[model samples]
Target chain A: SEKQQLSIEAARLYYQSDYSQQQIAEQLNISRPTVSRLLQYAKEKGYVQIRVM
Target chain B: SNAASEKQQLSIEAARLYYQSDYSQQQIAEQLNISRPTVSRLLQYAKEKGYVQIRVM
Candidate 1:
């Protein structure tokens, strides 16, 4: 559940905030790789939707 | 939402708003909740987007 929590928060920050992966990792006190993986999972889970809007 | 990329897009949108709607920079900035400099940058980016056309008044 901790892992899932990291992934969800990472993805949310990526889509909603103006922070870089590295910055997000620092803000979340997690490693960069973890952020990357969480972002990948978020994409897979359809939580990172992007369009013209 | 890369801030730089987002800023670029915002600039383009601001330019479109300025040209299409005749909105002032302050108006656009206020409505978009972005700084005036960002709005100015967006207007410049809009030129790159080919959405800015200046005509003599």
Candidate 2:
């Protein structure tokens, strides 16, 4: 579930902000791989909700 | 807020134009008199500070 928690926050920030994965990782003090995995988890968790502007 | 902070001011204006005016990266670059990459970085900085809201659309 640790991965789950990391993914949720990562996805939220990614979807809500314009920060790149590298930038997010820097701000969150996590590695790029961790951020990448979190993004994958985010998609798997159905937080990858898409909407048209 | 120092008078000597031209770069800071430019960055702020860049962010304003990017988020408030719907200006593209190229357009903001021209308006702010900065390079496209600088504008892009400033926008990213703005996002980090919660100045703009970007949603997946």
Candidate 3:
């Protein structure tokens, strides 16, 4: 019931686990585009960070 | 304002040590005297509580 639970988990898998969008989509039962959108949403929500170094 | 605030404070500490100081979850658990899983939970709690804000730059 936590807000952004899905987004957080998705972002964690993608950013922290280095999962691909397709991989996450398959494993998390979401569509690939949805996975992409979720990652974007995580960034927009300030739930994720990326360092270019 | 008992355990709830206590956990919130702990979450804040964990967030600061992790995000600002770049402490790994393992180090955070050791420093906080909690299990690593609890440290993960605390960080998640901080995220959910909006105590920490991340930016991609």
Candidate 4:
């Protein structure tokens, strides 16, 4: 099993919903510190970029 | 899946440690609580994700 699974999902919820880290942690069962890191990672990874123009 | 997506994000966090943050490989491992080699793999993976560009001279 992929151990990093939820860590990634925590990121998705943050960006997918543009939620606060606390919100992601509560909904995704991840710690706020962990999810915040994941969201920051997603942005650096370029996954958080979306073209809406 | 959402699973795969999150995994990639995990890669990005690792990439920033060495790339943007100037962190040594082992420092990244210590901070991320992962092994040293995992740091190498994640940085490489981040490149594949189109988030970073590398050209070692």
Best model number under TM-score:
3
* DockQ of prediction 4: 0.02
What is candidate 1's local distance difference test score? 0.70
How do all models score by TM-score?
0.42, 0.43, 0.53, 0.45
lDDT digits (tens) for residues A1-53 of candidate 1: 67666777887676556478999989998889878988877656656642222
Instruction: Kindly list the per-residue Cα lDDT of model 3 for residues B1-57, writing each as its tens digit.
Output: 899989989999999898768899999999999999999998888877778764533
DockQ score of each predicted structure, in the order shown: 0.01, 0.10, 0.14, 0.02
Worst 10 residues of 3 chain A by lDDT: A44-53
Ranking by lDDT: 3, 2, 1, 4
Q: Candidate 4 chain A: minimum summed lDDT over ten consecutive residues — where?
A: A44-53
| Index of the highest-DockQ prediction | 3
Q: Model 1, stretches more than 4 Å misplaced?
A: A51-53, B1-57
- TM-score order, best first, reads 3, 4, 2, 1
In model 4, which runs have C-alpha deviations exceeding 4 angstroms?
A1-53, B55-57
- Return whichever of 1 and 2 wins on TM-score: 2
Model 2 TM-score is: 0.43
